[PDB]
Design a protein around this nucleic acid. Structure first.
Ligand SMILES: Nc1ncnc2c1ncn2[C@@H]1O[C@H](CSCC[C@H](N)C(=O)O)[C@@H](O)[C@H]1O
Length: 245
DNA sequence: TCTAAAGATCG
DNA sequence: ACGATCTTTAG
């Protein structure tokens, strides 16, 4: 089980075996909500189409892919004991928000991810990262994970776009795995959750397999009515919806 | 999920 | 300018 180099909310590392058991085979895997890319890192497709609405995330992945050695060397310098301080953190956060250099932002993004509060990724409406200091004992610099990501990324294209556009990229030899933001138990809207299912239905009718993961609720069972539903026991369970052609 | 402070929105 | 109520911000 390969780990992502990023902390990311809604990561699927603990559920990978269940996903891989129901994920269909194909030439290309399409992930409209790639996030930290835990599925991408733990599958074996010949090609990947990876997308996310987060532009900082997609830019970071491109930098790591194309400028691997350069990035690792620069990012490693921020993972020293000197930087594990509140005053230093908030200046690096300010430098990130004020930088117009994709490389420097990518370097700082990793620092903020592993030194920031609970590994959160939060912005304001002005597009500024505003997660406070995390106060960890000793943040781990994911060098091994970075190089492995770069290696696997050689067979992947990255796109910053919404799910509707990325799922439109899927062709006959594609398999689509969707890991949308969790459905509410009591921003990704309810309409977007439903629209995702409608796009999935359209895809499978063109003989393109789609696998969606979400919480197991009354709403998600309704949204994914036209799919074979598998319950994953994990109090709420996890749901896997497979649209098989 | 928390919240005090600042800004948004409408009549 | 006012008042009530969200909305946003960010530790
Ligand atoms: N409208 C949208 N279109 C495409 N991606 C979106 C989106 N709204 C949210 N997202 C992205 O979907 C991701 C869901 S978290 C899923 C993470 C991933 N499965 C992993 O293993 O790491 C988030 O990173 C978020 O940035």
């Amino acid at each position: 089980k390969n780990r992502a180099f990023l902390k990311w909310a809604g990561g699927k590392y603990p559920l990978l075996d269940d996903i891989k058991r129901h994920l269909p085979k194909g030439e290309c895997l399409v992930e409209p909500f790639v996030g930290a890319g835990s599925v991408f890192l733990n599958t074996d497709f010949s090609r990947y189409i990876l997308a996310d609405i987060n532009s900082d995330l997609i830019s970071l992945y491109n930098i790591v892919k194309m400028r691997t050695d350069e990035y690792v060397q620069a990012a490693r310098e921020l993972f020293v004991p000197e930087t594990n301080c509140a005053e230093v953190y908030y200046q690096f956060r300010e430098e990130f928000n004020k930088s117009q250099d994709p490389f420097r932002r990518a370097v700082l993004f990793l620092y903020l991810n592993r030194y920031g509060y609970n590994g959160l990724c939060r912005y304001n409406l002005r597009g500024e990262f505003n997660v406070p200091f995390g106060r960890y004992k000793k943040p781990y610099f994911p060098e091994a994970e970075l190089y492995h990501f770069a290696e696997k990324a050689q067979n992947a294209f990255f796109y910053c776009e919404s799910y509707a556009d990325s799922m439109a990229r899927a062709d006959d030899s594609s398999v689509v795995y969707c890991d949308p933001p969790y459905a509410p138990l009591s921003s990704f809207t309810l309409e977007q959750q439903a629209h995702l299912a409608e796009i999935a239905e359209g895809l499978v009718e063109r003989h393109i397999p789609v696998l969606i993961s979400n919480h197991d609720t009354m709403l998600t069972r309704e949204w994914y009515q036209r799919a074979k539903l598998h319950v994953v026991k994990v109090k709420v369970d996890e749901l896997l919806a497979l649209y098989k052609p």
